[model samples]
Target: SVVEEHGQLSISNGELVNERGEQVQLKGMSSHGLQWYGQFVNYESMKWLRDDWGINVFRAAMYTSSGGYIDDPSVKEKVKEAVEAAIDLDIYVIIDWHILSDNDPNIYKEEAKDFFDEMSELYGDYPNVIYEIANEPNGSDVTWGNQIKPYAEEVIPIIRNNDPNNIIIVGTGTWSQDVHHAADNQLADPNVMYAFHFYAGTHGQNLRDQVDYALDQGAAIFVSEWGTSAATGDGGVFLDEAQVWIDFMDERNLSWANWSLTHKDESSAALMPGANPTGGWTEAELSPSGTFVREKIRES
Candidate 1:
């Protein structure tokens, strides 16, 4: 319904907008690493999330380490599968180069270059595909001016060469919490958006204030990944704080995807242990965090 209505998405005036020229906020789920939770990324389960959960976007988190693309390149097949599913579903899908333990994008710069080069050449024509070049550029030394921005400058053109206009999301410093840094020294692409991640139980007003500063400085932002639990993916579902974040995004018309769609033991997992991998999840099959996030997306 979303893609059918919106057609294509681009940034204008530091906000995401449809081709029709209206601010659009895409509410959806992001998968866990394809290496560990690849089964949930199939078409049947994604159909469930699209229909039952009322989502309009999906993120394929393709990790580069931890038995990911670097360890085994077969993980890219899973990503292509998810991309095909999302395209078939007519929903927005973010192909994320999920860099967590890898920390720096430069570490895998050449691999990322080739990976995105191939991905863009293959799927660049699709309207629903969005490229997240880096998942999280971490480490205190990984400053935007020095590390993250330079990596983005190098990798973005590789994607742009094939998928020139698709919205490319670049990662920020301090695990993508440093939007302020990105806003000041941004890449020279109009359609590019900055990545800002948070966990409701862990991040609070301080982060919001930082996001505010970034917004005021005029940078397109996207919550490419977020969680209702703590940053560790397990903890109490901090609904109050999550509500605050929901309100923040809603008010600003910022698009976002929830942390994960999995059956892992973590609180962020939408499904309970041993829940069916395909569609047809009952209410009983959803975890507490799942129930809360489902209602939030449905309400939207």
Candidate 2:
């Protein structure tokens, strides 16, 4: 258990460190979306990932639009379930406010505020919880200063009021790739970290250089979401580039979560289509991406 070992995670001089000030890199998988892949995130599956795959963190992506929390508030229950499961398993979990279709995070700022308020109040005392306020603030106009930063400024306080200790992750501009913009003008919150997302096939050295620039600016970077496949989710796997990314993260001690764990018909999905929703998955049930990620997570 990550929470048991690390106790509490906080930002320190542009790095994620445990209470003892030692660097802590959380490697884990993320759910596709609670609305669609809710069953894949139960205690059984999470336990399997923790015990077999060596995962220390899990991301529950609760989309705001596209029949997500906005459309059906019942999705809130799913998020609560995941949080509770993480608590029971003694691992860290990120409550992701997955803002994709709603490109600008401000579109549903009120709802996000309420969601974080409720979640932080619920799980504030538990070190197993982390708040990812925005998944990916996308589009041209949705720059870090204009949309993502302002939106985070509003929602972050709401969480801090309830839970002041856990780390909060905010998305960067251009689908979380333009991290330099966020680094230049970061939030005043001390425990905040900027998200940097990438797909091995779509993002390469240039993106890495962008992150390097952010690091130079003394910003704490978290690869909150990434894929081994293309950005489109199903183009193809890029193991060569993914290895480079893994090495890069290892060198930097950056925490990360793989794109998805669903059995969706996509190259990024960790499981084969029609794979069992619960746990007990064998090597035969794993997809190529899953195999690679499992191996990576198992690495010491």
Candidate 3:
């Protein structure tokens, strides 16, 4: 169905609409910090996700400080591989500049510009590429006005200069929890959406209420990364709470990507330890989180 809607995607009235101006709620999976999970993002795994998981999009999260783009610039080639695979599969893909421990995106502002510049040059012609300028802004110093907004304002134009019309998702403050703040000072640019990341066990109705506030204020929202695990990325899977959050997003018709597709020994990781990175995995090989997310995506 995603292939049938193949064309430039844009934001219209707080929703991601296809080229025909029909609203689309993309259900997909996000890669773990690419510095470590790059192996699972290859073509084989993408194909499995496209065909088996019924995913409509794939997010490539290239970490900026954790021995990723900053340390080995060449690793961007790995990100490109994921993008290329999405194009070939006729599904949407997100180029995520995953900023977690680093907290502030402005730290690697110039590197982000150069990375997106090259990304736009190479895949800008395709409709599959969506830019996620920043991942999650944490710490007390990070704020919508001072840190995140300024970073997006600077990086968004770099993308626009080359690719004028694909959707761009900007991160909000407080680990992407402060969507209301971003809504109050939304960007002047069109076709942009704000990101919200959460973990079901850690974030409950309070986070949902925040999202509702942002939506009421007319901000397009996308759940770029969420887990059934606790906020710490390790813990028991809270299926009930996760379902509640999923229902909330479903009611709003918001697009979402579950976190993540790694085989790490964490509750958030989808695959079990030593599962084939290239996919072709059966239910027996999936972790509890993976089984749950796969079922949800299929149901979508």
Candidate 4:
């Protein structure tokens, strides 16, 4: 049914659409750092997510720093496994160059080019693959025009050369909260959407206002990463604010992926400590955020 509904996704006038030109809003989970949660990203867990959790998209956050893609390099293969599994399951998948500590994507520009070059060559043909060029570009000095946009401009062509049809998500500055900047500048490419990350407990009306402005200015947005906890990824889950954000997204038909699927002992991590990494989770194995997110996904 997902395949039937979301066949060959594309961007049409600030909306993600299927082959029939109908809007398709993705609801799913993003994995925690691959190096930390690599065991959980396999065929069984992905299958469980698709069949039981009602998730249609999965994002593999191949962290750029943190001993991930840049340091270890081999983690990219682990991420590739998840991408391949999503394709086999007939679901949408995002290959995220998960950048946080590095702050600027240009730091790993060459590596990113090589990585996307390989990924596009391998999975570009598949309709299910969505490439997130950058995850979260932070740091006070960072700006969309100087850092994020230039990086996207360079790497986007690499993907377009090999895979032109699928959607590409580009992250904005200020931890991806600056969607209005991208909307104002506008990337000179088609089928490209801007990333807006949020933590409901920390971000509220101001962020919503930014999103509202961006949407009004014809900027397509995707919530590639968000948490019910504080921006630090730990704190009490703010159900009320999260509900309001969910309602906002539902009204606009915005696609989103929750913060993570990990057994890390944190509010944002979906699974409890020692939960089976290969799927088959019970309510007991889910964290508070995990339990709530699972319920929300099922409701959709």
Candidate 5:
């Protein structure tokens, strides 16, 4: 059941199937640059949600132009290793093609072919993995829909051909946050799952409403990224905003992972000590606003 069947995804009676042939909900978080993070990952820092937090999804930030093109054998290996780690932990992982303004899907297609092909061969039998074509895509007006459209169309069939039943995530312009716009002329692949990122402060009910609209139109939405800050907070008010989204998600049965579990600096941390500019807390402590986050965690 894990191996794709004949390079064409099997959709039975309106619902797409995972390796277990069950309808799946992806609850996850986004990690900036996976290769860099993977280098230092071990039991302590990477073991929280997979073991304690009771969450089952993660998004690994991958760079297409990272280390010069997604096809580079070196970067591909890094991606593979990181994904394997997540799988071993028994959680689903989203392999994002972390995009930049200038990357062309065509430039990365061959490499995408190799990278995904290899990944499919290795873990295609595993039910807990999904592929996010691109992280946050950006470019000028012309490139927004047109450029991304063709690439998604082209690359999807490639992955579909390999890991036919695996979830093939597609994104739209405005850096994947604005997928509703793409729904106007959305592609018609059953395995094509729509992805969007949510930052508690930056996106509001407006975005959530839009997501509802897309879902109404038959688009599958996955909030692959979310953070706690007010979307306007400088850095100190992390926990309050984080709680808001966590509460909403709890009610909706929507799956989500925090922005990040660790950070090299205060600006990106969810758990800290008194919002200190240097040094992180020992044994999972939170700063001032972090107390708010703690409150929500307790409620959950």
Candidate 6:
């Protein structure tokens, strides 16, 4: 059973634990603008994430320009509804601030602080919900470090005060890909887990090797975001090589969620247009970069 302490949450057994001690393993997909704004909305999308894919955890990629749950009351309601739906289905959800500088958390500090506090009050007590302070801090070095730590220090407390038991996912500098550097710092909470969004090819073997090493050293790591194509810029096709990594995680009993639920581009994704099409995955189909992900899931 996971437990909560000082608003910090961790997983005990096969589930995430809160500061108070709760057991919840969030399994699901990262929420997408594609499915949310689609003609059908996320219900059908969630089907794949929850039912078909057997995922129980979810992450909402927040865009400040698009409101980030503050400016748009309707979006907030929709998100709340989506989260409740997840709870109903016995899953976990993450409130992700999909910031990449343009939606810099620093720029929206006040709003973010208030939003996280309220969000926690509403769902923090629920074991199925988690908060990711920021998606990717963008650009390494002390500048990135300076910006995120303070914000998390400020924001996490609010959530901690309210729920104190919800899991918090923290990302590293420069697009959540810097594992080695992240392992160097400590967050406000030990229950807090470190995150890395890898797409392979972009970071190459060095980054993967480093993260693998971190995991080997007992560093808690969560792959908050992962996908095919070169989101990493190496034009990474998350196919063969990525599978080996997945196999490794399975061996360790670690958890992860796919990058998206749905996208469109009839030209690209059958579900989410977050990236260019890698292969047979239609714009509507959620392609797992070839058959390996599915095959791994099958084995699981």
Q: What TM-score, computed on C-alpha atoms, does each candidate reach? A: 0.98, 0.98, 0.98, 0.98, 0.76, 0.78
Model 2 pairs whose backbones collide: none
Q: How does candidate 1 fare on TM-score?
A: 0.98
Reference-based lDDT, each prediction? 0.92, 0.91, 0.90, 0.91, 0.57, 0.58
Runs in model 2 deviating more than 4 A are: none
Residue 50 Cα positional deviation in candidate 4, in Å, after optimal superposition: 0.9
**In candidate 5, how many Å is residue 285 off?**
5.2
Every candidate's CA RMSD = 0.9, 0.9, 1.0, 0.9, 5.4, 5.6
Model 3 lDDT tens row, 1-300? 575565888888888888898888888999998888889999999999999999999999899888988988777998999999998888999999988888988998999999999999899988888899999989889999999898889999999999998889999999988999999999988889999999987858888999999998889999998999999888889999999988998999989999999999999899998689998998888999999999999998
Q: Report model 3's TM-score to 2 decimal places.
A: 0.98
The residue-by-residue lDDT of candidate 1 on 155-194, one tens digit each, is: 9899889977889999999899999989999889899999
Off by over 4 Å in 6: 1-27, 34-44, 66-73, 140-144, 216-218, 232-236, 266-295
Expressed as tens digits, the lDDT of each residue in 180-280 for candidate 6 is 66566656575567777766445356766777765655567777777654573234364655666676555555567655544433211224445322223
Q: The CA-based lDDT of model 1 is what? A: 0.92
Per-residue lDDT of candidate 4, residues 2-79 (tens digit): 865668998888899999999988999999999888998999999999988999999999998998888899999998
Model 6 TM-score on a 0 to 1 scale: 0.78
Better of 1 and 6 by lDDT: 1
Q: Candidate 6 lDDT (Cα, whole model)?
A: 0.58
Clash tally, candidates in order: 0, 0, 0, 0, 3, 35
Badly placed stretches (over 4 Å) of model 4 are none
